[PDB]
Subunit: 386 residues, 4 copies
């Protein structure tokens, strides 16, 4: 049966640890894929870990130069949550160097972008069967969420970006039914920059928190209903969400130009005028991670918060993060549960190796007692292959 | 429920990438079978990758001399599409150095040919249970499709060849029900040569595009109905389909003797008087791959085409190719979807190794935007074992 | 359907061997997790082996320093009984350095304790979904059974400990329904010490046999009904159950202070005034294992027994042991079958390696002919990595 | 539904190849169990390969001294037919150095014998749950079929042996229902020797062809009905079935004392007064294998045959062989199909290695065209570990 998506988000006071795979530690001897850009998505029965492979195993010579973002060898694959991405336990999804996946209640939807940087094609699959296609319309690295898409009342929604990563680009919202695109709208967003959106369903509508790689150290957001009537803006909080970023001063409801160039994929959960910000602890590199509750952060511009929860220590490597949700028809709850994952990147450019990969931790939002701690990657680099 | 097979082929303007396994790259460290002659076939539930193993793993000493075509150690096995052929994730099918497989809607049919070159026996299995047998009738390397068989209204059809590979041989069409041969007809084809046919269902009838190893650089074809009433001929197009071949001149509706000796397994889709030819880019070796749409290529002899789509680059290794189809009762579409796979051969005779193996890419025919690119094997030879 | 848990324990005269995984022997070359604290639990369909990983494989550098009890890399995972804990065949359960699991008849309940030693959090999952949480209330290493919990008429029960391991601590019994804590009671037990309880259902009530790490070489027990009305005491037998321990003299119904400090996790089955004691053969280290039937051992203090069955030889390594049960709705029997497992620890501190791990054997209680023997670990240390 | 077992054996003129695993060749690099005594058994859904592990992998140090027959580390495990016995794809069955397994139509029955040579215990499991037990009654290596048991109308039947292997021993037939022994009869067989019986169902009755290790180069047989009313005798054929054996002279209906000491496990199918003998090609060692049809071999004593089919070449290693059957409710046929497997032993005592193991081939009896050939093991010894 289709996921309704009409209920609100569950009240959350803390984040309980859900999964840890230990990919790089196990990959030291085991047959584990060299991956990056992992994300979690749930069906009514199970939650799966999606990831973009480099078509190579850890501690093997083919992992050479895997800092490279896009190649013909990259494939989207999935394994059960908390397990290592192995050739022996992973399910093939698509050929992709950029990806998105979600379950509507009946079947899996996957989106796999492959091809040249000037003509990339998104291949849409519903239950493993190709159902539609989208070509790059700006001929400049067609790219998508790198996290799960959002589904409401039988439709699934995604955001795609085409154009430069250091200037004004083109941003489109898609409405997809049974793997077929039924509607799409280009966003009227001058001076905005949307990339790698973390989108979640809330009260029959979708909220995406994205990455401004152009000139924003705070995060851009986009909200829309099923007809794709959207709103745009930035998170106003003085507690900035991207990386790199400045120190916490007064925030802006437009793009914070200071330390605005570059970025990292992230997420945030809106609760009225308040926001749950997940961010790196460091302001200059991808190190550490923390959940922060700013009761006025979504619309207000000050740098105040009432809750901080440690996830990864200041001196430990982190990386990508993203939102996922668990629906009522999975949990039995009457609200939509917010969860998140964190990618822990190891290797290049920061470490003296020939390779780049990442493992994953995940947390779910509860309304009971929790604790801050550091759950780092734990691998001892360099490897035999280095 | 049985596959009907009464509908036409879906209109196709381009080919979207469906799967890539990265077998040789992963096999560098992982436990991956040394294979050749892979093919894809689909049930109403899933698509599987079939392959002929050499009974040995990559980067192991037992892969020595695996350029050899036929041995007692070769077995037909299958794994899910896009996954690596591993001993830990593959299903055993038959003991075979030549194979064919297809799903009638209810159960899998596999055909496995093993035995001596002068008395080979095809073992037919329906749902894993031996249901029939065929002995070599010319005592000269009984061989079959190396791709999937075609099924229409509860029957499945195959083509087998017995005799020389550089002269006139014997060619038989088989009709199989629930694993048992109910009818067979020898083809009256003097001056023709049929080997390794790629067969597909279309409007309650079967079209096979095969390999003329004798004296044909263009491809032979055979069409038949359920009663095995057949027609024979060659693809008339001036864009020649086999490898090795000449340059593109005026074609013939008989065998093109020029560069006619030897060959490679291939496929083609008939659309009225038009043909979708898949072929190597090189004319002298198994390198590159491209899809070409000749609107008049099936019956006309000129060398004109209106669409060319790149699949594998001119300098990159390719190999075998074959057709597969997805039926309406799998896709939900009202037509039969044409797809294809490409084997990418690495090692002997062209490379300085002790072994020979191949990985696989696959594409499905869509009527929306697509792109040409190169999706090569990607392995760095020689291996530690060499 | 829910497990009733109203029937008695089956009469047992001997213990038949149920499973042996050979983890360390296979882990010498294979990809097997470095584990400790394994336990078995059964659903109405299957029995599974639960275990706490160190997030590393055997014979790999990441197994360095795995004598360490608690880390952020430890995860609770399960595989089918008798199989090796491998990344390729194991199911992820929780992030935990202390664990408990049980099936109520409908779904799995897992309890995973992770976090700092002064703020640890137990994460409760029902069918893989977080359903509740418990924080450390003494801020001193919140710890649980390391064996399966007990379930009766739709509820599941566990025991947790918080405080010192060489003095008076705090002990709580929990009643859990569908993953949610519905009732909890702190035990009024001055001069008692409860740790790592082996709990089993018997006649709609629960009996736990635990570990007194403080000052007891005999084992403490706690019995309770569904409303958590409990009784406390020690096993009176002169045949002492813990390790280290003294020689067999007259026992006490209170804690036997002699050789009382430290300990090991164990189990015992009450049959009226009689007890089935499972214990190490050695009195100073974790070596050997034996089942002993003392017809008066539960309430009487003498050192007499009528049955002794050998399990592991005196010179062979053992370790943890625990109870598990098989219910009527699994076996078809009209009573609850008692079974047990034994962890066989190899490596540090007793062996010259960089690592510590354990394999597992298991036995079930039958009322027919059996035999004593030694089923040791069988691995030849040190390993290549040492 | 229960297997009826009332129908006759299918008429067989030849043997088509069913499976080949290539265990030792793949085990050279892959993680494959060191095994011996493999056998095949089928349920109404699938056929499985059962095998006795040594609790160690090939090309690992723990495979040292695996020529040893009985240890505490040996376990009975099963994997799907034609697949390699791997820790990642195998199901655990029992702890055993002697085994038997069969499916009654509803659930699997396994028999696992472990323990000391003077007190061994057979542990009976039905659907993975211990249901009964048998102790050694002669205190001299209690041993069983090493092949599948036979099932008729809801009961399953086995043969066990206790006593010396070079003199008169004790032989018992068991009738088992739902894992419980309901009847057993000791065979009145003075001057006979029964070991490692291959038993099959035929017309509501069971025929076992066994091994005379004492003084018989021809094979002993035992037939019985469901009430265990038995007949005993030897295969009269002048074509002797065991190994070692003499040359083919006139046979005896009693034990052929000439070259009678020692032996190997085998099988034979009775068809009236005729017999399908499977045997090694060599008369002094375990080399080669062949199927021979003697139309008068069961009751007549001459050395004539009308069909010989090659299976393994004279210079290639063989080993154990055994019968298996496929029932009507699996095949859809109205008769019981006879099949067989062959173990191909490699290593000690005949080869310069530290280990001993075996791979497996299997054939099923068809009434259509077949071929003789050699399907050897194919591994190149010694291994890196030697
Ligand atoms: C499609 C693509 O190449 N996306 C890039 C991403 C991107 O370049 C930035 O957002 C700027 O546009 O950068 C990063 C990154 O780690 O910052 C990795 C992503 N790699 C992959 N998704 N494979
Ligand atoms: C049955 C058999 O040996 N088929 C051969 C095939 C064949 O020799 C040619 O078509 C000429 O007859 O050649 C090739 C080839 O790569 O050209 C591989 C096939 N190998 C395997 N299918 N194993
Ligand atoms: C939670 C925790 O650290 N438990 C410890 C346990 C414990 O220290 C003693 O019972 C004393 O309190 O000791 C041992 C032990 O081998 O004795 C291992 C356990 N390790 C793990 N369960 N990981
Ligand atoms: C139970 C047992 O040890 N059975 C032995 C078997 C036996 O010794 C002979 O039949 C003589 O009694 O010999 C052989 C053999 O290869 O000849 C292997 C078997 N090994 C195993 N089944 N593990
Ligand atoms: C969710 O959908 C159901 C079924 O349509 C309906 O009962 C309910 O109103 C929706 N939830 C909310 C919170 O409106
Ligand atoms: C990686 O690639 C670089 C250059 O492409 C080369 O110099 C180096 O040797 C490679 N390293 C390995 C381990 O293959
Ligand atoms: C396919 O078979 C169905 C059922 O027999 C029938 O409705 C239809 O006519 C067939 N399709 C075509 C295109 O004729
Ligand atoms: C492969 O075989 C050839 C001859 O058969 C031999 O000379 C060579 O050493 C072998 N190579 C390996 C790696 O086993
Ligand atoms: C077990 O529960 C069933 C169903 O409620 C009941 O028949 C029975 O009384 C209980 N068993 C015992 C031993 O009381
Ligand atoms: C283990 O760690 C110690 C110190 O932490 C170090 O000296 C040693 O080299 C390590 N051993 C291995 C095999 O990594
Ligand atoms: C097999 O059993 C069925 C059902 O009892 C019966 O029809 C038949 O007589 C039996 N088969 C034979 C060959 O007697
Ligand atoms: C095997 O064992 C023997 C003696 O038990 C020993 O001499 C030899 O070194 C061992 N070999 C290996 C490879 O472990
Ligand atoms: C979509 O589903 C049903 C039927 O189309 C409709 O009643 C429901 O309100 C719609 N979902 C929404 C509005 O989210
Ligand atoms: C075969 O199936 C049915 C019943 O035999 C028949 O009606 C149908 O037309 C046949 N299939 C064809 C002609 O493709
Ligand atoms: C709990 O289950 C049912 C319904 O609540 C009740 O009848 C039964 O007696 C209770 N279980 C017990 C007392 O163990
Ligand atoms: C056993 O099964 C049924 C019911 O007990 C009986 O009718 C049948 O004849 C028996 N099976 C035999 C005789 O093989
Ligand atoms: Ca930015
Ligand atoms: Ca040719
Ligand atoms: Ca103690
Ligand atoms: Ca003999």
């Amino acid at each position: 049966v289709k996921l309704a998506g009409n209920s609100s988000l569950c009240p959350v006071s803390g984040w309980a640890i859900y999964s840890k795979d230990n990919s790089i530690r196990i990959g030291s001897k085991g047959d584990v894929f060299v991956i990056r850009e992992p994300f979690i998505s749930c069906s009514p029965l199970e939650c799966r870990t999606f990831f973009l492979t480099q078509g190579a195993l850890l501690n093997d010579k083919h992992s050479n130069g895997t800092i490279k973002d896009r190649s013909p060898y990259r494939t989207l694959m999935s394994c059960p949550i908390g397990e290592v991405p192995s050739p022996y336990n992973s399910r093939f999804e698509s050929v992709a160097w950029s990806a998105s996946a979600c379950h509507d209640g009946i079947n899996w939807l996957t989106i796999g972008i492959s091809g040249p940087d000037n003509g990339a094609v998104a291949v849409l699959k519903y239950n493993g069967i190709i159902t539609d296609t989208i070509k790059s319309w700006r001929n400049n690295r067609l790219r998508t969420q790198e996290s799960e898409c959002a589904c409401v009342n039988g439709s699934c929604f995604t955001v795609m970006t085409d154009g430069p990563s250091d200037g004004q680009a083109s941003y489109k919202i898609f409405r997809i039914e049974k793997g077929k695109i039924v509607k799409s709208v280009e966003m009227n967003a001058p001076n905005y920059h949307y990339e790698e959106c973390s989108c979640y369903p809330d009260s029959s509508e979708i909220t995406c928190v994205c990455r401004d790689n152009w000139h924003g150290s705070n995060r851009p957001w986009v909200s829309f209903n099923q007809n794709l009537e959207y709103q745009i803006g930035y998170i106003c909080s003085g507690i900035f969400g991207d990386n790199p970023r400045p120190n916490d001063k007064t925030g802006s409801c437009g793009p914070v130009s200071s330390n605005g160039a570059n970025g990292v994929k992230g997420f945030s959960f809106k609760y009225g005028n308040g926001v749950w910000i997940g961010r790196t602890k460091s302001i200059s590199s991808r190190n550490g991670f923390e959940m922060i509750w700013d009761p006025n952060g979504w619309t207000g511009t000050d740098n105040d918060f009432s809750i901080k929860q440690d996830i990864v220590g200041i001196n430990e490597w982190s990386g990508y993060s993203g939102s996922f949700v668990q629906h009522p028809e999975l949990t039995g709850l009457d609200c939509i549960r917010p969860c998140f994952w964190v990618e822990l990147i190891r290797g290049r450019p920061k470490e003296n190796t020939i390779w780049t990969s990442g493992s994953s931790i995940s947390f779910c939002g509860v309304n009971s007692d929790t604790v801050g701690w550091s759950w780092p990657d734990g691998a001892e680099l360099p490897f035999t292959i280095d």
